């Protein structure tokens, strides 16, 4: 009606105002400013360890905060916790639903979360007096598949789902404390800020949204991608983040200037990005692709620095240890590989 | 030497036991038949799953027939982007696609000229030629044959198929629509469509799905053996 048309016109005017403000704050691209800096060398990494035991496509992995333990889920109904130093299997947790799409490790190391096509984020207690691992809580309330989950502390976890919403849960009560709405497509990944006061999420609507955890509102919305955003990661500083999308490009967005900074794309690359992860200092942006290998990017110059080609199937998982010591990659070939540089 | 402490060796032994358990579980899972159940909303898939055997996530029904173990995965409760999770079912033995023969007359809830049977045809076209199901056979169940037979006397197929040039009797129309559904397969060499008209007695269609999965298992073994 007339009211709806007026509201649409007002929304278009606000969008034009936002774009004009972004253009006004856009004077010099980050690529121009970094043109005088010394490029990194050819970043060569070797497979230090290969973790075997999964019998199906690995879908997610997460490092523990101690940079030694990690958890991985592989849709064979198993959540395996690995000692990455000795390739030992610390735990093998059987899952009720073998359609897991995500997994997480609590920063305290006491819990691991996982979820998938069952729309349930299951929390597992690792430190039990019985010596086994049990389901501490089963969070329900998402009407779409669980796509990502990240622990804030031992009692708070934020999940992203295919029902175009993200939910901040209270694990003790099992109830959704806050629901984040505004995405018009399936939310495919989220990344918590270093201080866990903010988090970004990338959705199939080719847009990323910055959410305030405490308030529950969408602070900012970043566009530019031409397809679904399957991966997101925060810059270690916390004032920027990177998105990996099906359009075979990675993009670095900054929060303060509210716009894109650089695109990490190559003509030889035509497959989408399934995972992104920054280096310890943020100089390197590692991204996993469907062409079975992970490409290392000079985050400050958009120049490809190295290739991690060791997987026979799509590289679905990525992760850099909290100390920057190593980067682990999971893949649909049922193997995880820990990579590291050489002097 | 060994350069392993007592606790390190005990942890290695625990990891070996975990590996043994994982191998046993993998063998058990490999000795199984996984079927993906698809179809429209009111396609009779609930009736089918009743004959074979809280959250609107995924529903797994586990049943056994003639020392063969099946796990059907009803996924119709997922309203999100299908292309974002359909690759999770790459390794399913077969896809059970259910369509309703009665839907050649009823129009969709939107009532925008999009026939329900046309929606089923679109879904079958999308699934059959999906990049993840190039070698996956499809067991097509044509549901509600009895009330379709009852309704075929009043309204013919001309409403849904303007190109239909056959008599409005039951068997000719059923064969026509079955051929149209089978003709959507652009991979007639790599995959086979096992079409069956579901009967009131469960045993007939459970036997049909058993035979179809046995045949596709033999064909997969032949493909892994160099033959075929």
């Amino acid at each position, epitope marked *: 009606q007339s009211e709806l048309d007026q509201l649409r016109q007002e929304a278009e005017q606000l969008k034009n105002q936002i774009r004009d403000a972004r253009k006004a704050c856009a004077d010099a691209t980050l690529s121009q400013i970094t043109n005088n800096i010394d490029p990194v060398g050819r970043i060569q990494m070797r497979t230090r360890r290969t973790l075997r035991g999964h019998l199906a496509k690995i879908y997610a992995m997460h490092w523990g905060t101690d940079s*030694r*333990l990690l958890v991985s889920a592989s849709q064979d109904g198993k959540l395996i916790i690995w*000692d990455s130093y*000795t390739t*030992n299997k*610390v*735990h093998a947790i059987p899952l009720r639903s073998s359609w897991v799409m995500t997994c997480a490790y609590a920063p305290s*190391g006491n819990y691991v979360a996982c979820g998938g096509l069952d729309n349930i984020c299951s929390i597992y207690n690792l*430190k039990t*007096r*019985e*010596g*086994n691992v049990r389901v501490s809580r089963e969070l329900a309330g998402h009407t779409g598949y669980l796509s990502c989950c990240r622990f804030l502390d031992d009692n708070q976890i934020v999940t992203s789902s295919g029902d175009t919403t993200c939910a901040l849960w209270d694990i003790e009560t099992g109830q959704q404390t806050t629901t984040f709405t505004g995405h018009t497509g399936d939310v495919m990944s989220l990344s918590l800020a270093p201080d866990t006061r903010l988090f970004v999420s990338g959705a199939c609507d080719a847009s990323a949204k910055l959410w305030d955890v405490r308030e529950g509102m969408c602070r900012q919305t970043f566009t530019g991608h031409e397809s679904d955003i399957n991966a997101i990661c925060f810059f270690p500083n916390g004032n920027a983040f990177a998105t990996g999308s099906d359009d075979a490009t990675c993009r670095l967005f900054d929060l303060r200037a509210d716009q894109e900074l650089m695109t990490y794309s190559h003509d030889n690359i035509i497959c989408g990005i399934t995972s992104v992860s920054f280096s310890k200092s943020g100089r390197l942006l590692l991204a996993g692709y469907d062409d079975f290998n992970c490409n290392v990017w000079d985050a400050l110059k958009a120049d490809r620095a190295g290739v991690l080609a060791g997987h026979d199937n799509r590289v679905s998982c990525l992760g850099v240890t909290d100390d920057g010591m190593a980067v682990a990659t999971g893949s649909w070939d049922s193997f995880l590989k820990i990579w590291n540089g050489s002097s | 030497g060994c*350069t392993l*402490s*007592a*606790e*390190d*060796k*005990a*942890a290695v*032994e*625990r990891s070996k*036991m975990i590996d043994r358990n994982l191998r046993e579980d993998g063998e058990k899972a490999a000795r199984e038949v996984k079927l993906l159940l698809l179809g429209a909303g009111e396609s009779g898939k609930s009736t089918i799953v009743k004959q074979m055997k809280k959250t609107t996530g995924i529903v797994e029904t586990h049943f056994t027939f003639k020392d063969l173990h099946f796990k059907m995965f009803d996924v119709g409760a997922q309203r999100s982007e299908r292309k974002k999770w359909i690759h999770c079912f790459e390794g399913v033995t077969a896809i059970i696609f259910c369509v309703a023969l009665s839907d050649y007359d009823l129009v969709l809830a939107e009532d925008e000229e999009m026939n329900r049977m046309h929606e089923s045809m679109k879904l079958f076209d999308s699934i059959c030629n999906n990049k993840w199901f190039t070698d996956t056979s499809i067991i097509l169940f044509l549901n509600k044959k009895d009330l379709f037979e009852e309704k075929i006397k009043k309204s013919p197929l001309t409403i849904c198929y303007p190109e239909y040039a056959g008599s409005n009797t039951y068997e000719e129309a059923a064969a026509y629509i079955q051929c149209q559904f089978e003709d959507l397969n652009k991979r007639k060499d790599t995959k086979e469509i096992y079409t069956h008209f579901t009967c009131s007695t469960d045993t007939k269609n459970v036997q049909f799905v058993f035979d179809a999965v046995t045949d596709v298992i033999i064909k997969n073994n032949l493909k892994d053996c160099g033959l075929f």
Partner: single-chain antibody
Amino acid sequence: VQLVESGGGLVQPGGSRKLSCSASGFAFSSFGMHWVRQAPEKGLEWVAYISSGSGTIYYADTVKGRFTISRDDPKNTLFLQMTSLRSEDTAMYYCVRSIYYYGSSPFDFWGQGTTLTVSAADIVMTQATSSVPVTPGESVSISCRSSKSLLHSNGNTYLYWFLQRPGQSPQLLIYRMSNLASGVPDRFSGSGSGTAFTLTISRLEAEDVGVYYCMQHLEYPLTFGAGTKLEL
């Protein structure tokens, strides 16, 4: 978690006796199990060990060839078949559960004990002090020394501290020389580098009296200290 043992009593020397240990409240099959004896008015002495899955079995030298340790996982029982018992076997036998993985806490739970009475290159852990007078409110530091360096190449220092309250089974306080066991208040702390270790109990309070034992877990002939007694 509960471990109950039975089968003790008066045994003629040269005879045989079977000790049992029924477990409850925890995953028995996932835990390696130890037998630890304590002669009357003497310190602890490790006897035998059976791994999770019965894959690995170890014995002390004084019991090799006469004691057999076996487990029955389905019925959650641990056995110790003893043959040709000598008067030196008169002790109280404890059932100790112990799970091993990265960051694990072995020897965490001990059974109540069953009394047996027979009527007639190892690392040496030294606890020079045998009795220390204490007062409630002050801090008491207990010293320990080992013949070998317990610091392995992986960085772990395999030293364990146990508390045995009067008329009670030992309980774990510190594992691997620095990590406080679950259920232990922060008043207990451990230190040391390679061969000398100390356990300080700041703000000592009652019910902390009893014998404190040090155990090494570097080489499987596990050896306990003489035990330092804390008298109020």
